[PDB]
Scaffold this active site. Structure first.
Site, PDB file in Angstrom:
ATOM      1  N   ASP A   1       0.834  -1.232   0.000  1.00  0.00           N
ATOM      2  CA  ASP A   1       0.000   0.000   0.000  1.00  0.00           C
ATOM      3  C   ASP A   1       0.842   1.244   0.000  1.00  0.00           C
ATOM      4  O   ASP A   1       1.895   1.266   0.613  1.00  0.00           O
ATOM      5  CB  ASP A   1      -0.985   0.016   1.156  1.00  0.00           C
ATOM      6  CG  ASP A   1      -2.313   0.701   0.801  1.00  0.00           C
ATOM      7  OD1 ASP A   1      -3.377   0.362   1.394  1.00  0.00           O
ATOM      8  OD2 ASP A   1      -2.329   1.585  -0.085  1.00  0.00           O
TER       9      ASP A   1
ATOM     10  N   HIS B   1      -0.482   4.944  -0.174  1.00  0.00           N
ATOM     11  CA  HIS B   1      -1.007   6.215   0.281  1.00  0.00           C
ATOM     12  C   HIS B   1      -0.727   6.519   1.717  1.00  0.00           C
ATOM     13  O   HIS B   1      -1.058   5.728   2.552  1.00  0.00           O
ATOM     14  CB  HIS B   1      -2.513   6.378  -0.008  1.00  0.00           C
ATOM     15  CG  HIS B   1      -2.854   7.804  -0.314  1.00  0.00           C
ATOM     16  ND1 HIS B   1      -3.505   8.630   0.579  1.00  0.00           N
ATOM     17  CD2 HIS B   1      -2.480   8.594  -1.357  1.00  0.00           C
ATOM     18  CE1 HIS B   1      -3.595   9.840   0.059  1.00  0.00           C
ATOM     19  NE2 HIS B   1      -2.975   9.850  -1.111  1.00  0.00           N
TER      20      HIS B   1
ATOM     21  N   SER C   1      -5.212  -4.297   1.621  1.00  0.00           N
ATOM     22  CA  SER C   1      -4.465  -4.006   2.798  1.00  0.00           C
ATOM     23  C   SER C   1      -5.107  -4.627   4.012  1.00  0.00           C
ATOM     24  O   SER C   1      -4.429  -4.826   4.992  1.00  0.00           O
ATOM     25  CB  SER C   1      -4.391  -2.539   3.006  1.00  0.00           C
ATOM     26  OG  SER C   1      -3.655  -1.994   1.925  1.00  0.00           O
TER      27      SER C   1
HETATM   28  C1  B12 Z   1      -9.732  11.352  -1.862  1.00  0.00           C
HETATM   29  C2  B12 Z   1      -9.697   9.855  -2.115  1.00  0.00           C
HETATM   30  C3  B12 Z   1      -8.541   9.362  -2.906  1.00  0.00           C
HETATM   31  C4  B12 Z   1      -7.224  10.050  -3.225  1.00  0.00           C
HETATM   32  C5  B12 Z   1      -6.378  10.072  -1.927  1.00  0.00           C
HETATM   33  C6  B12 Z   1      -6.885   9.081  -0.868  1.00  0.00           C
HETATM   34  C7  B12 Z   1      -6.798   9.437   0.607  1.00  0.00           C
HETATM   35  N1  B12 Z   1      -5.797   8.919   1.293  1.00  0.00           N
HETATM   36  O1  B12 Z   1      -7.628  10.122   1.181  1.00  0.00           O
HETATM   37  C8  B12 Z   1      -6.662   9.409  -4.591  1.00  0.00           C
HETATM   38  C9  B12 Z   1      -7.242  10.404  -5.551  1.00  0.00           C
HETATM   39  C10 B12 Z   1      -5.205   9.570  -4.347  1.00  0.00           C
HETATM   40  C11 B12 Z   1      -7.450   8.165  -4.429  1.00  0.00           C
HETATM   41  C12 B12 Z   1      -7.153   7.202  -5.271  1.00  0.00           C
HETATM   42  C13 B12 Z   1      -7.792   5.921  -5.357  1.00  0.00           C
HETATM   43  N2  B12 Z   1      -8.727   5.511  -4.477  1.00  0.00           N
HETATM   44 CO1  B12 Z   1      -9.712   6.699  -3.355  1.00  0.00          CO
HETATM   45  N3  B12 Z   1     -10.634   7.671  -1.993  1.00  0.00           N
HETATM   46  C14 B12 Z   1     -10.758   9.033  -1.813  1.00  0.00           C
HETATM   47  C15 B12 Z   1     -12.017   9.294  -0.965  1.00  0.00           C
HETATM   48  C16 B12 Z   1     -13.036  10.077  -1.800  1.00  0.00           C
HETATM   49  C17 B12 Z   1     -11.697  10.007   0.372  1.00  0.00           C
HETATM   50  C18 B12 Z   1     -10.449   9.514   1.129  1.00  0.00           C
HETATM   51  C19 B12 Z   1     -10.281  10.274   2.431  1.00  0.00           C
HETATM   52  O2  B12 Z   1     -11.179  10.367   3.279  1.00  0.00           O
HETATM   53  N4  B12 Z   1      -9.120  10.813   2.721  1.00  0.00           N
HETATM   54  C20 B12 Z   1      -9.088  11.479   4.021  1.00  0.00           C
HETATM   55  C21 B12 Z   1      -7.770  11.244   4.761  1.00  0.00           C
HETATM   56  C22 B12 Z   1      -7.452  12.318   5.771  1.00  0.00           C
HETATM   57  O3  B12 Z   1      -8.103  10.227   5.669  1.00  0.00           O
HETATM   58  P1  B12 Z   1      -7.683   8.679   5.689  1.00  0.00           P
HETATM   59  O4  B12 Z   1      -6.679   8.336   4.588  1.00  0.00           O
HETATM   60  O5  B12 Z   1      -8.968   7.915   5.767  1.00  0.00           O
HETATM   61  O6  B12 Z   1      -7.198   8.592   7.203  1.00  0.00           O
HETATM   62  C23 B12 Z   1      -7.798   9.209   8.313  1.00  0.00           C
HETATM   63  C24 B12 Z   1      -8.316   8.056   9.129  1.00  0.00           C
HETATM   64  O7  B12 Z   1      -8.345   6.948   8.214  1.00  0.00           O
HETATM   65  C25 B12 Z   1      -7.275   7.906  10.260  1.00  0.00           C
HETATM   66  N5  B12 Z   1      -6.104   6.984   9.960  1.00  0.00           N
HETATM   67  C26 B12 Z   1      -5.491   6.766   8.773  1.00  0.00           C
HETATM   68  N6  B12 Z   1      -4.450   5.863   8.835  1.00  0.00           N
HETATM   69  C27 B12 Z   1      -4.320   5.526  10.150  1.00  0.00           C
HETATM   70  C28 B12 Z   1      -3.453   4.664  10.821  1.00  0.00           C
HETATM   71  C29 B12 Z   1      -3.575   4.455  12.205  1.00  0.00           C
HETATM   72  C30 B12 Z   1      -2.627   3.500  12.889  1.00  0.00           C
HETATM   73  C31 B12 Z   1      -4.639   5.204  12.952  1.00  0.00           C
HETATM   74  C32 B12 Z   1      -4.789   5.019  14.433  1.00  0.00           C
HETATM   75  C33 B12 Z   1      -5.524   6.062  12.260  1.00  0.00           C
HETATM   76  C34 B12 Z   1      -5.410   6.239  10.885  1.00  0.00           C
HETATM   77  O8  B12 Z   1      -6.744   9.230  10.451  1.00  0.00           O
HETATM   78  C35 B12 Z   1      -6.665   9.859   9.171  1.00  0.00           C
HETATM   79  C36 B12 Z   1      -6.888  11.369   9.308  1.00  0.00           C
HETATM   80  O9  B12 Z   1      -7.514  11.719  10.554  1.00  0.00           O
HETATM   81  C37 B12 Z   1     -12.577   7.886  -0.616  1.00  0.00           C
HETATM   82  C38 B12 Z   1     -14.096   7.687  -0.517  1.00  0.00           C
HETATM   83  C39 B12 Z   1     -14.428   8.082   0.929  1.00  0.00           C
HETATM   84  N7  B12 Z   1     -15.514   8.842   1.025  1.00  0.00           N
HETATM   85  O10 B12 Z   1     -13.739   7.779   1.950  1.00  0.00           O
HETATM   86  C40 B12 Z   1     -11.699   6.976  -1.416  1.00  0.00           C
HETATM   87  C41 B12 Z   1     -11.428   5.502  -1.410  1.00  0.00           C
HETATM   88  C42 B12 Z   1     -10.573   5.275  -0.138  1.00  0.00           C
HETATM   89  N8  B12 Z   1     -10.413   5.230  -2.428  1.00  0.00           N
HETATM   90  C43 B12 Z   1     -10.743   4.056  -3.100  1.00  0.00           C
HETATM   91  C44 B12 Z   1     -10.067   3.534  -4.279  1.00  0.00           C
HETATM   92  C45 B12 Z   1     -10.554   2.197  -4.748  1.00  0.00           C
HETATM   93  C46 B12 Z   1      -9.220   4.291  -4.977  1.00  0.00           C
HETATM   94  C47 B12 Z   1      -8.453   3.866  -6.217  1.00  0.00           C
HETATM   95  C48 B12 Z   1      -7.921   2.404  -6.133  1.00  0.00           C
HETATM   96  C49 B12 Z   1      -9.383   4.084  -7.403  1.00  0.00           C
HETATM   97  C50 B12 Z   1      -8.705   3.737  -8.722  1.00  0.00           C
HETATM   98  N9  B12 Z   1      -7.922   4.761  -9.029  1.00  0.00           N
HETATM   99  O11 B12 Z   1      -8.892   2.642  -9.386  1.00  0.00           O
HETATM  100  C51 B12 Z   1      -7.270   4.842  -6.217  1.00  0.00           C
HETATM  101  C52 B12 Z   1      -6.014   4.266  -5.536  1.00  0.00           C
HETATM  102  C53 B12 Z   1      -4.893   5.318  -5.482  1.00  0.00           C
HETATM  103  C54 B12 Z   1      -3.524   4.586  -5.282  1.00  0.00           C
HETATM  104  N10 B12 Z   1      -3.534   3.304  -4.973  1.00  0.00           N
HETATM  105  O12 B12 Z   1      -2.412   5.104  -5.408  1.00  0.00           O
HETATM  106  C55 B12 Z   1     -11.844   3.334  -2.407  1.00  0.00           C
HETATM  107  C56 B12 Z   1     -11.022   2.335  -1.636  1.00  0.00           C
HETATM  108  C57 B12 Z   1     -11.805   1.268  -0.908  1.00  0.00           C
HETATM  109  C58 B12 Z   1     -11.578  -0.025  -1.602  1.00  0.00           C
HETATM  110  N11 B12 Z   1     -10.390  -0.653  -1.614  1.00  0.00           N
HETATM  111  O13 B12 Z   1     -12.571  -0.422  -2.142  1.00  0.00           O
HETATM  112  C59 B12 Z   1     -12.517   4.447  -1.559  1.00  0.00           C
HETATM  113  C60 B12 Z   1     -12.952   4.014  -0.132  1.00  0.00           C
HETATM  114  C61 B12 Z   1     -13.750   4.866  -2.348  1.00  0.00           C
HETATM  115  C62 B12 Z   1     -14.787   3.796  -2.411  1.00  0.00           C
HETATM  116  N12 B12 Z   1     -16.019   4.279  -2.537  1.00  0.00           N
HETATM  117  O14 B12 Z   1     -14.524   2.595  -2.356  1.00  0.00           O
HETATM  118  N13 B12 Z   1      -8.664   8.231  -3.736  1.00  0.00           N
END
Ligand code: B12
Length: 577
Positions: free
Chosen positions: A107, A109, A160
């Site tokens: 993974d 990101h 993952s």
């Molecule tokens: C913006 C986004 C992206 C971005 C960046 C992702 C990101 N990290 O946020 C980009 C545009 C880069 C991306 C790409 C893709 N994504 Co996208 N993404 C989105 C979206 C719309 C929001 C993600 C988000 O909330 N980011 C917010 C950041 C701040 O939060 P976070 O990463 O979740 O982490 C927070 C918490 O998780 C926590 N946390 C995180 N890590 C850890 C670790 C520990 C130990 C702890 C305690 C807490 C913690 O704290 C963080 C901040 O407070 C969602 C849909 C959704 N509504 O969630 C999907 C989503 C995650 N992505 C998805 C996918 C599939 C893709 C792609 C594979 C699509 C494709 N291109 O074919 C690609 C993969 C990119 C890659 N592999 O390089 C799917 C993944 C789920 C799945 N496997 O089915 C989602 C869920 C959409 C869906 N409807 O399914 N996307």
């Protein structure tokens, strides 16, 4: 001649932390140092008092995450100044606990992990961030060698989850005792409790966001709550396990053959699919000047943990001033990257003659349609349906036996290959605000490229809507004919189909973007998927499929059933193990 310059050094340090000001940090820290006996006295006293105030203000809702990150910046500069003095001395520094944190193997990101880390460093936890695509062996070795009190794991995509269970199991097998922390976009409390927790006898905790993590960590590293908290979480996970435990009012399943018999009812003989103006593969680039107009700013604000939708977030009575300064910082960064050509968005696009056979799409070398260069495989919804089709994305493409010429597109785009290099430069300078800024901007650029390029395709390469004239807001609301489903989303959930896109476009050759073994993409800021033009095409969730589809899908792909069960775990309408 400056009120705060006149306060005692220790109140100056606080004010400079709270306000994110760096200009006097060295001298104020140099002064505090002399004021004290051991260098570490400075970090443990005024520096953490500073972060004490920062934390209470955040707690009250008077500071938000972008400002907390700017405070962390003043703190790591104080410390970076101090490190010489601390090292070239006796004592070596009391912290509240040490965490090893990683993005899981396969993974890529790390924005969310980055933020969890920064926040915990502001609460005086030492954080050992092992980066991304980290092997379970690397993680457990580091936590031993370093004596971590916690391990935390982040994951974006579905594969993952498997890696996380694999880490839990290795921790058990080596007899780890410390808490395992779980979070990330794919993770959930339901999945932690049902699939992860039972594999490890130390505590396993799902945590939703950075903010909550702080309280979780403290509850776990306290000698008067640890036990109370652990029991409570376990009692929660037991409940969650018996709840989902009996598969809650599920719809009834259907045979694969009954699903296919209820496919999308359409009259192919009356329809003429639009004919791609262009066919073939082309590499593409788009400047930051072009792409900035296509940016969807809302997920960016969301990433910086400011709630609200753009442009209105800027006027919001609570977060508006900070949303504006976050946005002004983002635009100044874009202006430099764009003037200096240090981040260069890039991708590859392609259109192909194609036609549905069964639940797959056959892809041909040219318009004679006699040599099949690759196959796009898809799944069919397998629940019982009232009126509606049991959809499959292939359904939106002319069946081969209709004799209608149809087409399919694919794309892979990235906000730019420099993203990791730019991020390391800022990590090197202890600047987490700009490290998270460029990575979050690169992601806004990948998505903007995907919208822009899709539009180029509607209007030009495929060319079935050359007069479409849609505002940014109408683009975000998807008012255009056709879809760009991306593997991984519930509408095409099988992540390994990215291999097909990589094959059809030669992505890695044309643009440098790579697939990990979980089929994540590198750079983190990348999007790839397909193009369909049918006007009734939509993103219908595939959902819950049966053994019979897994087997047949296994055959179409030359995979074993178990390999397939693993790739499709979240969509199986049955318990595989
Ligand atoms: C913006 C986004 C992206 C971005 C960046 C992702 C990101 N990290 O946020 C980009 C545009 C880069 C991306 C790409 C893709 N994504 Co996208 N993404 C989105 C979206 C719309 C929001 C993600 C988000 O909330 N980011 C917010 C950041 C701040 O939060 P976070 O990463 O979740 O982490 C927070 C918490 O998780 C926590 N946390 C995180 N890590 C850890 C670790 C520990 C130990 C702890 C305690 C807490 C913690 O704290 C963080 C901040 O407070 C969602 C849909 C959704 N509504 O969630 C999907 C989503 C995650 N992505 C998805 C996918 C599939 C893709 C792609 C594979 C699509 C494709 N291109 O074919 C690609 C993969 C990119 C890659 N592999 O390089 C799917 C993944 C789920 C799945 N496997 O089915 C989602 C869920 C959409 C869906 N409807 O399914 N996307």
């Amino acid at each position: 001649q400056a009120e705060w310059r006149s306060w005692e050094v220790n109140k100056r340090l606080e004010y400079s932390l709270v306000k994110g000001i760096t200009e006097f940090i060295e001298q104020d820290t140099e002064e505090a140092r002399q004021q004290a006996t051991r260098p570490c006295e400075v970090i443990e006293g005024p520096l953490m008092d500073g972060m004490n105030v920062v934390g209470d203000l955040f707690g009250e809702g008077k500071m938000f995450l972008p400002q907390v990150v700017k405070s962390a910046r003043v703190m790591k500069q104080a410390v970076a100044y101090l490190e010489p003095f601390i090292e070239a001395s006796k004592e070596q520094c009391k912290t509240n606990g040490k965490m090893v944190i990683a993005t899981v193997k396969g993974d890529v990101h790390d924005i969310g992990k980055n933020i969890v880390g920064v926040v915990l460093q502001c609460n005086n936890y030492e954080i050992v961030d092992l980066g991304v695509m980290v092997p379970a062996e690397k993680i457990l070795r580091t936590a031993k060698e370093v004596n971590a009190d916690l391990i935390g794991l982040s994951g974006l995509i579905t594969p993952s989850l498997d890696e996380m269970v694999n880490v839990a199991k290795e921790m058990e097998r080596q007899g780890f005792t410390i808490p395992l922390l779980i979070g990330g976009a794919t993770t959930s409390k339901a999945h932690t409790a049902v699939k992860i927790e039972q594999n490890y006898s130390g505590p396993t905790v799902y945590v939703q966001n950075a903010s909550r993590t702080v309280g979780v960590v403290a509850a776990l590293l306290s000698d008067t709550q640890r036990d109370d908290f652990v029991a409570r979480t376990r009692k929660e996970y037991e409940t969650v396990r018996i709840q989902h435990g009996r598969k809650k009012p599920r719809t009834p399943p259907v045979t694969l053959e009954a699903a296919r018999d209820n496919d999308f009812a359409f009259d192919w003989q009356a329809y003429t699919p639009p004919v791609a103006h262009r066919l073939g593969v082309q590499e593409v680039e788009a400047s930051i000047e072009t792409l900035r107009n296509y940016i969807d700013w809302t997920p960016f604000f969301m990433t910086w943990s400011l709630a609200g939708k753009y442009p209105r977030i800027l006027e919001d009575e609570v977060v508006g001033v900070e949303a504006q300064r976050l946005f002004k910082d983002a635009n100044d960064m874009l202006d430099k990257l764009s003037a200096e050509k240090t981040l260069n968005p890039r991708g590859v696009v392609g259109l192909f003659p194609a036609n549905r056979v069964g639940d797959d799409i056959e892809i041909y070398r040219d318009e004679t349609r006699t040599h099949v260069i690759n196959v796009s495989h898809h799944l069919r919804q397998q629940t019982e349906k009232t009126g509606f089709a049991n959809y499959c994305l292939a359904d939106f493409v002319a069946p081969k036996l209709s004799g209608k010429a149809d087409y399919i597109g694919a794309f892979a785009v990235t906000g730019g290959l420099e993203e990791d290099a730019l991020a390391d430069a800022f990590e090197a300078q202890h600047d987490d605000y700009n490290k998270i800024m460029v990575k979050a901007l690169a992601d806004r650029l990948a998505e903007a490229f995907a919208e822009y390029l899709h539009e180029r395709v509607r209007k030009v390469y495929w060319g079935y809507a050359p007069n479409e004239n849609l505002s940014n807001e109408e683009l975000i609301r998807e008012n255009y004919q056709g879809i760009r489903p991306a593997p991984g989303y519930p509408a095409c959930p099988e992540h390994t189909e990215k291999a097909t896109i990589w094959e059809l476009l030669e992505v890695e050759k044309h643009t440098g973007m790579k697939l990990t073994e979980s089929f994540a993409m590198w750079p983190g800021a990348s999007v790839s998927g397909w193009y369909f033009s049918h006007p009734d095409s939509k993103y219908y969730a595939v959902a819950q499929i049966q053994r019979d589809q897994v087997e047949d899908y296994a055959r179409r792909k030359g995979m074993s059933v178990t390999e397939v069960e693993r790739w499709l775990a979240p969509n199986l309408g049955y318990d595989a193990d």
